[PDB]
Amino acid sequence: APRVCVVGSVNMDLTFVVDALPRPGETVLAASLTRTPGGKGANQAVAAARAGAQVQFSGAFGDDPAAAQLRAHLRANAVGLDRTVTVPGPSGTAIIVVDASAENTVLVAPGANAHLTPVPSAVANCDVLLTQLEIPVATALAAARAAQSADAVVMVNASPAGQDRSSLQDLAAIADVVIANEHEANDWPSPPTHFVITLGVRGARYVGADGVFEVPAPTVTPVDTAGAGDVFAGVLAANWPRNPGSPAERLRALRRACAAGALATLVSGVGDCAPAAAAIDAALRAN
Amino acid sequence: APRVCVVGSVNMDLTFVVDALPRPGETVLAASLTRTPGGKGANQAVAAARAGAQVQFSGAFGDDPAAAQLRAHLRANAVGLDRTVTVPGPSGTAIIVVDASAENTVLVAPGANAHLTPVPSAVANCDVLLTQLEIPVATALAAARAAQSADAVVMVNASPAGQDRSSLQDLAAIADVVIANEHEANDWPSPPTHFVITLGVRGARYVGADGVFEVPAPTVTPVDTAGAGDVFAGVLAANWPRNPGSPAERLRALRRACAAGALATLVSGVGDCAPAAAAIDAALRAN
Numbered sequence: 001a002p003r004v005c006v007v008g009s010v011n012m013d014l015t016f017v018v019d020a021l022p023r024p025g026e027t028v029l030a031a032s033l034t035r036t037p038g039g040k041g042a043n044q045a046v047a048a049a050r051a052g053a054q055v056q057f058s059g060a061f062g063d064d065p066a067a068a069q070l071r072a073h074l075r076a077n078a079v080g081l082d083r084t085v086t087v088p089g090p091s092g093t094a095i096i097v098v099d100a101s102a103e104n105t106v107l108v109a110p111g112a113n114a115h116l117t118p119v120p121s122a123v124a125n126c127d128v129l130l131t132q133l134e135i136p137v138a139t140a141l142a143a144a145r146a147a148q149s150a151d152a153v154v155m156v157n158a159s160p161a162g163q164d165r166s167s168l169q170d171l172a173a174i175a176d177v178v179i180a181n182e183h184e185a186n187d188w189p190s191p192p193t194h195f196v197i198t199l200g201v202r203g204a205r206y207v208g209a210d211g212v213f214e215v216p217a218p219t220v221t222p223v224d225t226a227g228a229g230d231v232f233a234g235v236l237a238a239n240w241p242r243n244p245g246s247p248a249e250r251l252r253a254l255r256r257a258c259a260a261g262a263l264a265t266l267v268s269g270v271g272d273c274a275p276a277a278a279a280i281d282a283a284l285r286a287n
Numbered sequence: 288a289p290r291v292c293v294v295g296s297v298n299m300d301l302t303f304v305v306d307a308l309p310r311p312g313e314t315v316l317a318a319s320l321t322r323t324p325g326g327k328g329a330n331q332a333v334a335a336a337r338a339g340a341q342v343q344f345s346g347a348f349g350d351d352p353a354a355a356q357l358r359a360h361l362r363a364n365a366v367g368l369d370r371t372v373t374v375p376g377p378s379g380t381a382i383i384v385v386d387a388s389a390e391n392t393v394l395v396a397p398g399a400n401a402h403l404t405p406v407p408s409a410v411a412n413c414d415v416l417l418t419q420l421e422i423p424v425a426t427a428l429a430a431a432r433a434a435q436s437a438d439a440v441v442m443v444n445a446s447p448a449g450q451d452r453s454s455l456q457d458l459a460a461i462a463d464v465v466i467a468n469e470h471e472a473n474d475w476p477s478p479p480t481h482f483v484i485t486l487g488v489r490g491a492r493y494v495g496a497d498g499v500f501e502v503p504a505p506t507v508t509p510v511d512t513a514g515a516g517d518v519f520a521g522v523l524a525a526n527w528p529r530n531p532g533s534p535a536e537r538l539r540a541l542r543r544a545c546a547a548g549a550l551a552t553l554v555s556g557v558g559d560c561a562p563a564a565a566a567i568d569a570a571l572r573a574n
């Protein structure tokens with residue numbers, strides 16, 4: 001069973017249904033508020049666990065009631081929490097407002113995620129380290145260095161986009177694999193050994209040591225495409241070969257990640273849409 | 288020592304600092320996030336208490352972990368809770384967003400507050416009833432009727448706008464004092480005996496039985512306007528003459544409310560920014 005370590009963010013997603021966003025100086029009432037655990041790090045960790053990896057999540061919870069819910073969510077998905085921390089203050093928070101014209105406005109605050117401390121002995125004995133950019137770069141960097149020493153694959157989801165160019169250079173230099181959609185790729189300072197670019201419905205493409213190729217997605221009709229990125233990243237990490245690897249294994253992993261990303265669109269919601277490993281097999285046979 | 292009774296809402300506030308207010312569709316990363324007790328009802332009770340009134344609050348808490356923090360906040364500011372209830376499910380949630388120019392947007396999922404029904408003891412032995420519109424309008428109406436029977440002042444903060452029209456109409460019919468910003472004054476069914484239209488950092492406008500006039504506010508560099516209105520409202524309630532009153536006593540109340548409101552903008556934070564009676568005095572002496 002492949003061992004994955006995720007060092008990344010966990011957010012409480014608060015989704016408000018409103019008629020319109022509030023104007024300056026205005027108070028507006030929501031029709032509903034729905035609370036759902038999320039954040040890139042936790043989404044990816046769940047995706048990886050559902051896909052069949054043994055996952056350890058290393059992240060930071062606040063001391064708010066939200067933190068208890070985020071813990072319950074990860075534990076129920078068989079994600080390990082030996083190596084997380086509790087820091088005073090709020091958990092990472094994402095506010096998602098859906099209005100009457102079905103536009104989504106998002107507001108994210110790092111909360112606890114900004115206080116995350118590297119745990120090098122945790123990335124020891126794991127095959128794949130998966131990290132993203134909702135935590136501070138320095139922490140992702142620290143974790144990436146530990147994985148390098150432990151001969152673990154360093155896999156970075158270059159997300160969110162719009163990170164500052166030179167702050168990312170040291171991390172770019174050290175990544176084996178970088179996952180990114182097209183927009184995100186443009187903000188990544190230098191190509192890794194294995195650059196994997198996601199293409200919404202189409203699937204993904206690869207450019208690196210194994211050459212250059214498209215990896216198509218089983219075709220499906222979407223219900224909700226949110227959360228499909230995080231599923232892709234988690235299923236990639238759960239499937240990428242340990243070092244030194246081989247093109248056929250990396251390819252197998254890419255196809256599996258595409259299939260899963262495609263399946264995640266079939267379900268509504270962000271944090272709960274990761275398919276099980278059997279569903280990924282099924283979807284792959286069905287082509 | 289004036290007896291003010293607030294029937295209204297209590298919420299946990301999530302306050303985000305941004306550069307610019309998110310636009311429909313946008314994804315914004317926030318600079319900071321705080322989690323503090325609030326709600327128009329609560330803020331107004333606290334402000335009235337710090338202003339020297341003897342204050343009872345009547346609202347609905349959820350049976351959730353947030354409730355204890357909210358209750359504790361009111362007790363720490365000397366507000367009474369004997370007429371409050373508990374509605375199973377969540378306490379209210381609010382998202383406040385504050386930007387560079389100290390402007391703010393407020394979005395509320397009222398939770399328990401939307402299920403506040405009329406509490407029998409709610410208004411006994413009070414000089415002034417202060418209410419607002421996050422709770423059901425029917426409940427604010429009931430509180431108003433009971434206040435008139437006991438010859439208490441019916442004071443309504445007509446916020447948020449757009450609530451149940453027929454209940455609004457019945458309430459507008461009997462209200463003594465209505466506090467509202469320009470947008471909210473507009474949505475209100477018919478004018479009260481004393482119509483107090485707030486004007487942000489400029490202070491307030493009066494329309495009613497005392498005539499028509501402006502009341503300037505001390506000139507200040509706003510740090511954060513979130514919560515300043517609730518301060519105005521509570522301070523008003525704490526100083527409004529027992530019916531019947533002199534124009535001089537009403538005027539003194541408006542003056543103090545403007546001074547207080549402007550003080551409240553100097554402080555970051557929503558539910559904690561109300562000044563003590565002595566700071567209102569010190570601000571008024573300095574003109």
Ligand SMILES: OC[C@H]1O[C@H](O)[C@H](O)[C@@H]1O
Pocket residue numbers: 027296297298299300324325326327328330380381393395421513514516517557558
């Ligand atoms: O006026 C600001 C208040 O409005 C909402 O009720 C929030 O809870 C916040 O405390």
Ligand SMILES: [Mg+2]
Pocket residue numbers: 224225226227228264265266267268269270273
């Ligand atoms: Mg989905």
Ligand SMILES: [Mg+2]
Pocket residue numbers: 511512513514515551552553554555556557560
């Ligand atoms: Mg303030």
